[PDB]
Amino acid sequence: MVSVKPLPDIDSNEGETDADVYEVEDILADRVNKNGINEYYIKWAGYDWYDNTWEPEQNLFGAEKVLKKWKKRKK
């Protein structure tokens, strides 16, 4: 075998993470699984207008402001 260590393949600098982050226009509705995962109907901006889909809260780590706003106004 060869003995090599990992490289900094992932950037450590903060900047453009668009590849793993899309805009949250706002929440359109919500849902919860039986497995214990909560999901919301997100309108992702930056993408096509018809792209909106349900995503878990887990991906909404940045959209807590908008999500919690939703959950505040709607249960």
């Binding site: 982050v21 899309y22 805009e23 226009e25 997100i42 991906n59 959209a63």
Partner: peptide, 18 residues
């Protein structure tokens, strides 16, 4: 810029079926 929020979007997945 417009002050707005963003989130991941799990872009990728596979349904385990045969």
């Amino acid at each position: 810029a417009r002050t707005k929020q963003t989130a991941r979007k799990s872009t990728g997945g596979k349904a385990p079926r045969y």
